[PDB]
Design a protein around this nucleic acid. Sequence first.
RNA 1: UACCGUAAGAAACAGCAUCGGCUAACUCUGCCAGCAGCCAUACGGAGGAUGCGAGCGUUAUCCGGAUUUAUUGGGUUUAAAGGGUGCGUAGGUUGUUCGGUAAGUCAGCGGUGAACCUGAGCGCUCAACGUUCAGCCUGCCGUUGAAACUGC
RNA 2: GAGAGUUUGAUCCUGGCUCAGGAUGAACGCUAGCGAUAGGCUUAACACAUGCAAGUCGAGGGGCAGCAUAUGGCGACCGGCGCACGGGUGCGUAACGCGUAUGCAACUUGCCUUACAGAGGGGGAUAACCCGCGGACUAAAACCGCAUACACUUGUAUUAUUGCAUGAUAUUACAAGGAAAUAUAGCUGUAAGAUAGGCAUGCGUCCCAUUAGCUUGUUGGUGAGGUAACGGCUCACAAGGCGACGAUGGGUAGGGGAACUGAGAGGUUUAUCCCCCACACUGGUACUGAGACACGGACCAGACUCCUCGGGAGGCAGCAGUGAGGAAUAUUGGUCAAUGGGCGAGAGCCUGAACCAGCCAAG
Lengths: 77, 122, 81, 200, 118
Amino acid sequence: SEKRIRQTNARRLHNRYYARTARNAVKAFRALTDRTEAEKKYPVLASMLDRLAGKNIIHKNKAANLKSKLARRINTL
Amino acid sequence: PTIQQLVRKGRESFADKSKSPALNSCPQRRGVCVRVYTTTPKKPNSAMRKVARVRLTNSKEVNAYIPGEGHNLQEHSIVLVRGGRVKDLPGVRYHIVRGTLDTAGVNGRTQRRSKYGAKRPK
Amino acid sequence: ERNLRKERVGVVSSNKMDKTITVAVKWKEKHPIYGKFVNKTKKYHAHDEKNECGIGDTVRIMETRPLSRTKRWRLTEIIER
Amino acid sequence: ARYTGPKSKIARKFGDPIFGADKVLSKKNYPPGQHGNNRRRKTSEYGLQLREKQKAKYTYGVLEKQFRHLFHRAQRAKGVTGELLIQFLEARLDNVVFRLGIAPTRSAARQLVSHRHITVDGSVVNIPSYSVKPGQVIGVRERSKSLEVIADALTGFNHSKYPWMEWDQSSLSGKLLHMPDRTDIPENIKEQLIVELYSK
Amino acid sequence: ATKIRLQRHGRKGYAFYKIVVADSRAPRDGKFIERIGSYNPNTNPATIDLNFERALYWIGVGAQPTDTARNILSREGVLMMKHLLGGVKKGAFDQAAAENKFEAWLKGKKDALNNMKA
RNA sequence: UACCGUAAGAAACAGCAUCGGCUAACUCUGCCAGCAGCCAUACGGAGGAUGCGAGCGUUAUCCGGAUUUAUUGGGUUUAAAGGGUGCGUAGGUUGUUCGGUAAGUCAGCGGUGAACCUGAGCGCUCAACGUUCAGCCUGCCGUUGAAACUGC
RNA sequence: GAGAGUUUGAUCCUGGCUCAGGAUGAACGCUAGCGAUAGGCUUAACACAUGCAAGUCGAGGGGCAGCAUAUGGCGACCGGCGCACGGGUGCGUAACGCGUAUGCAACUUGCCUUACAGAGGGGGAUAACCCGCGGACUAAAACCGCAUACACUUGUAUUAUUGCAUGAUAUUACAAGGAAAUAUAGCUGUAAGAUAGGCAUGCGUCCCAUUAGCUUGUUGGUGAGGUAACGGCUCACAAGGCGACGAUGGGUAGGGGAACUGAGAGGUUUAUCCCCCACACUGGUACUGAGACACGGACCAGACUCCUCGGGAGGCAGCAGUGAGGAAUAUUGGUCAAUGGGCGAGAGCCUGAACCAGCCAAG
Ligand SMILES: [K+]
Ligand SMILES: [K+]
Ligand SMILES: [K+]
Ligand SMILES: [Mg+2]
Ligand SMILES: [Mg+2]
Ligand SMILES: [Mg+2]
Ligand SMILES: [Mg+2]
Ligand SMILES: [Mg+2]
């Protein structure tokens, strides 16, 4: 019975770390102004979101929504 | 009424009422006799009927008629009460089931034994 | 090869909303018990992008996805004014 | 259950010796009890219908639930209700044995059927209420073809005159041709009274 | 996954099975997508009724049969690769001729003589 | 399935004055009771008879006759039941005729709607029951037509 | 598709009542032989002790206490899959909850099937073991990078066709970004299928008007955020929306097919059976997961109960005892032989589902 508790707790910490990292990266990217700098840091954050969706921490549709929003912003500066 | 009147209002149906409401749809009930007394019938009938005031388990007071020749019922006796009303007696709409719990069968019976809880003679 | 969304024909009952209108559709059918044919109406809420409808005009509406809270129809055509 | 009571009482109550021939029916033609042969109080039409139903039941050895089910079957079936009821009563296995003459009385036929001395289509059937269909073969079981009672019952029954029954003494068996008509059935039961009693 | 299995439907002491296509999570005698046959194991010839076309379709789309359902399908001849042949055509298996194999095996009948001479 | 030897191990319950199928004696307020009512063709016992029968009676609950909520299918002078009388809002109903429309209405086609329940089988020695197949789909939805009637 | 009696001195009406008939998950009284086939706490989502009810894989990994000289296998540990089903209950709920019929050009879907591609390199932890609760070491199909996917996601452009408005589909791309497992059967990406969910709609869905006004995210818009997904779902102008075709409030109830009943119309109930919904001592919050009201998971707050002085446990609406309540309802039974389910390459293991047996005037 403790095996389920331990596995659930370890997985909860593991998921929380990566989800929080991705959320902070998205929040930091949303505040950028320089178009060249935003275009330079967009690929790494897109990679982070797609890797999260692959690891199943978030949904592929959620990653797609976030990437679409950030690409639209980078288009409009 | 007109069809428009019936469309507007409609018809009403009223559910009937139980002839023995203190049973609460149970076929029988358990009770305790408060007072075991004797009563007089209506005008065209003359006798001394044996009735008991019974407190049912559902906290209801009933008047139950004790049938058969003679009984051993007293106060604080646990009895079984079933439905059935006597015509001449007013307000007595229940019967005591003989041969169950405290009340015993009618002694000396040979016919209609199952109605008075009398065992088959040897 | 589409799946033929529902369509209704009704009469505009209100237009005092930003790009939303109320359409009342009335019909007759027999009473389930007494057999008399009775009138009943049903109201709707439709989307009108161009605000091209007044009051009392006969309109045709089609079923759409939820566009708001209790707004599931769009205005296809206007049959009468 | 079975009636298994005295038979001359029922015979005298109904007048007709429905259980065969007896020496008691003469010099005694009154219903049993101390109140017999004291004139005849007017019995109602309902009483007459009831007595006809009881006569049929005591004749064929059938209890009330089975009789009611037989009436339901006749009502469902196509034809005259009373004629169908009498045909169904006569189509029972014990009645078929009795008509074939393997046993002297209907109760004797029922006892033989129950004790498994009767075969239907080559197989042992021991349900006395079994409904025999035309074209079937009902015969004595091979292990009991030399029973003294069966031999005595068949002695003198060389007639086998029933049109709807074909008897073969070589095989000790018989077959049913068709369902006989009510007029051909030799029973004094007025099925119309039973029909109205059960339908009203 | 989607499965081909039997629902027990007879009575006590006499089992009759309904060959259905059902989701594996469904109750044994409960919801089913489709009914494709019946199975009576009480008769010695082991009576089987089956819808060949529908059974083949469900096998094609990937329903997984239970052990007894697979045996029934094999006996009826659904389990074949004649359609799987990519290099041949009109390959009449004709195995139904051998699968007939009518087992008309009966039992001899004996009787006991009645020597009741008394 | 077969052999030993055995009628041997196996019947009660409720009625019996009319309705209701069943009768006379002995007792006698005790009682009975669905009703008419009875303190004896009605109470208790005895003998008989009548229902049913491994059951038979009592109570409770539900349905039908009950048209006692009446669309099918009731009424309102005197049995319960016309508002004290008008005007009038919503609603309900709308003389005759011509032409449109097709909402009601009518018709065709298509889809959809385990077990149980209905004719025919098959298997349970019969039967309950189990099972197969023909006959119900008589609601809903979609799509084509008709225009007598109602609606617009 | 049929009954009877009863108001009077007598009659014809009106009108209620009482008896006849059918049925039950019934109970009670007297009595009781068998077989078959059904059913069995209807009263409180009452209370208790014991046991069982969900595990499996040594063809994933380090290992080896129970055996042959790690090899048979296997306690524990890491890891994969399952426990969200089967099973139980009817509290709540008058609601797109349920029935019937549709829509999603606003959706998701583990295991299963098919088709097209690919399985290249590397790193760090920490269980167990060991030394004492703390420390040290280490493996994986555990976890995480880098490489390759242009079948996928995102952005832009071109061409063509087309729908029901938002639009949809198909070639052309350039650009960026996203995987894998090995052991003796498998793994990863994409697409289609099948299955299972979700959302939204037309119609139908109990009484009280001795309940007539209700509503301020409330009705619509713009934008943003969020979600699998559309949307006041949430957050930063206009005043609208619902209402005698019954809003709002109060009371009561899980809903259907069945079943019973009647000539029919209809009426009664959802006991056993099937489908949908709701729930798991009472509330709140989430986590894990393809999937959660989490039925043999967690945290917190309550109350109740039990065992212990530092505290620790339980939830009987899974199956059997028992007690209480009641007119009233059974064994702390056998087996996985059959059907179904989980896991496993298979053999196989588990299964209070199930199949059986026991008890009960018992239909
Ligand atoms: K007119
Ligand atoms: K999973
Ligand atoms: K098994
Ligand atoms: Mg019987
Ligand atoms: Mg008057
Ligand atoms: Mg007047
Ligand atoms: Mg990579
Ligand atoms: Mg999750």
